Amino acid sequence: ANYWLYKSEPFKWSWEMQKAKGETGEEWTGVRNYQARNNMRAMKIGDKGFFYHSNEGLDVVGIVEVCALSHPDSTAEGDLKWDCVDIRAVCDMPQPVSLKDVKANPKLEKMSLVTSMRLSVQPVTEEEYLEVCRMGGLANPPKSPD
């Protein structure tokens, strides 16, 4: 199963706004990075991931799931190389996990969140996902499809 992480600046799109969208979800527009785009193209319906507040907050505040496979980005004015998935809230992270705590955990040293400086949509290994979830108060967290 594949797990992911989505960076979102709370000033622009916060976790609260994400939850407010409910089951309708939110189109993940604005990605203009090939690797991030390709990560979205690798996602399947139901894949779980972290909603991380970037720029401000700097913490994992919730878990989301993919509710729409990669499709043309409605903000890319009918372009061809920019596409994205739609994601929706699954549950809050009981105790939001700070970037500081992540960087202090040896088991998370290879996590994209701490190694990549420009990737807005990233992969998360199953072990990294389970560890961050535990740190955040989630023993048996939501799982991605096999």
Q: Which domains does the chain have, with CATH numbers?
A: 1-146 (3.10.590.10)
Q: Residue 78 gets which letter from DSSP?
A: T
Do 60 and 51 meet the contact criterion of CB atoms below 8 Å apart?
A: yes
Technique employed here was X-ray
The structure tokens listed for 35 are: 């690797």
Of the CA atoms within 13 Å of residue 80, those in its CB half-sphere come to 0
Q: With breaks defined as C to next N over 2.5 Å, after which residues does the chain break?
A: none
* Whole-number Å distance between alpha carbons of 140 and 43: 21
Q: What is the rounded end-to-end Cα distance, in angstroms, of the chain?
A: 5
Do 6 and 49 meet the contact criterion of CB atoms below 8 Å apart?
A: yes
Cα dihedral 86→48→97→139 (10° resolution) = 150
